[PDB]
């Protein structure tokens, strides 16, 4: 037996009313699939929503251990195994996901074969194992038939665009997604919908459309029970307040910290968000990571040093950053820091060039403000705000 049902039965031995409560939590309306789920090996619910909801309600502290054991014992050819692939990927449970993928790439069911091959492209592209060109080409050769993988072939490109600081293609690409075409798997539909809500929050942020960015993150939060999506919602809401509301931006990042304390990756992301917030407002910064050579962390060391007129130490750190390789959005930030250190207008125009190239209409407010402080003509600033990149 799978650990999940062992624990569910030993707990129903001690309390019988758990039958009606688990049926309501899973949305079943009557315990008939519940009884079947506990009495014959291999029986699956109609929607993966059912098992996830019981696990989160009854054993929240044990979700990963229970779902890892339940997922990796599923018939890879089934709907349940295809839902578990999404559950795993959405949660960044990479070790569940990669086992399921090489398992479904191998089987004989064509739907599971497809999911596996597409999620594999997403993972290889996520890890810079393949370029975007070879991912698009490989996706084309798959002749993707299911609406779920037609939606996810586009989602995986969207995530790659967001992570490489290449925002201009995202708005038109996300418009191509129609999740109403997903009718066979309500759990994949509902989770993809959360995915789109959070991606739309990031796109609205990148367009400086801050009210809409916050509404989309709030809809993601009401739509989900998955920690990864709550994390990125609080992160994006907080980012949207960076230039206007210190206390509310901090409050959202601290709420993010509070829900991700057992997750080193998400905990690090909120420290980094609080680190940037405090540098934008030029306050004492207790969130700096002095033991890192990532561009993100090094940039913030330099920013804080500049803010407190320690120009030598900022020069040391910026010397480090010259010997690392930047993408477009990181380079725009690099020129912003160089301009503040050097008091050099040319650095601020190069900063603007690359925020234009990345299509970042939000962080561009940083070099724009510095140019205004140095007396740049207001008509020129308006023009830079208005023109765009090819």
């Amino acid at each position: 037996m799978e650990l999940i049902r062992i624990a569910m039965k030993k707990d129903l031995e001690n309390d019988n009313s758990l039958m009606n409560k688990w049926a309501t939590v899973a949305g079943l309306k009557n315990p008939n699939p519940l009884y079947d789920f506990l009495n014959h090996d291999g029986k699956t619910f109609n929607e993966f929503s059912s098992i996830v909801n019981i696990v989160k309600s009854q054993y929240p502290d044990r979700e990963y251990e229970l779902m890892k054991d339940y997922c990796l014992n599923l018939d890879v050819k089934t709907k349940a195994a295809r839902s578990a692939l999404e559950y795993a990927d959405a949660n960044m449970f990479f070790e569940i996901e990669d086992v399921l993928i090489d398992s479904m790439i191998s089987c004989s069911n064509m739907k599971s074969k497809e999911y596996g091959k597409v999620y594999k492209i997403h993972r290889e592209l996520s890890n810079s194992v393949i370029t975007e060109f070879e991912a698009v080409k490989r996706l084309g050769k798959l002749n993707i038939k299911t609406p779920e993988m037609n939606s996810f072939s586009r989602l995986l490109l969207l995530y790659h665009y967001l992570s490489t600081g290449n925002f201009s293609p995202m708005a038109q690409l996300i418009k191509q997604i129609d999740l109403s075409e997903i009718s066979e798997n309500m759990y994949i539909r509902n989770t993809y919908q959360t995915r789109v809500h959070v991606l739309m929050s990031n796109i609205k942020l990148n367009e400086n459309s801050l009210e809409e960015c916050r509404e989309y993150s709030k809809k993601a939060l009401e739509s989900t029970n998955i920690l990864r999506f709550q994390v990125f919602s609080y992160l994006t809401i907080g980012n949207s307040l960076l230039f206007s509301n210190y206390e509310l931006a901090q409050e959202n990042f601290l709420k993010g910290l509070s829900i991700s304390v057992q997750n080193e990756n998400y905990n690090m992301i909120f420290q980094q968000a609080l680190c940037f917030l405090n540098n934008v407002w030029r306050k004492e910064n207790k969130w700096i990571n002095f033991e890192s050579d990532s561009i993100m962390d090094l940039q913030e060391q330099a920013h804080c040093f500049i803010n407190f007129n320690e120009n030598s130490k900022a020069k040391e750190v910026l010397d480090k950053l010259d010997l690392l390789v930047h993408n477009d959005n990181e380079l725009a930030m690099h020129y912003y820091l160089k301009g503040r250190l050097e008091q050099n207008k040319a650095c601020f125009y190069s900063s603007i060039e690359y925020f234009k190239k990345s299509n970042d209409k939000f962080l561009i407010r940083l070099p724009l403000l510095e140019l205004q402080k140095m007396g740049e003509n207001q008509k020129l600033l308006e023009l830079l705000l208005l023109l765009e990149y090819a």
């Binding site: 959070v198 990031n202 994006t236 960076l242 992301i269 993100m296």
Partner: peptide, 6 residues
């Protein structure tokens, strides 16, 4: 820089 994610 500013962290971003979805």
């Amino acid at each position: 820089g500013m962290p971003r994610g979805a």
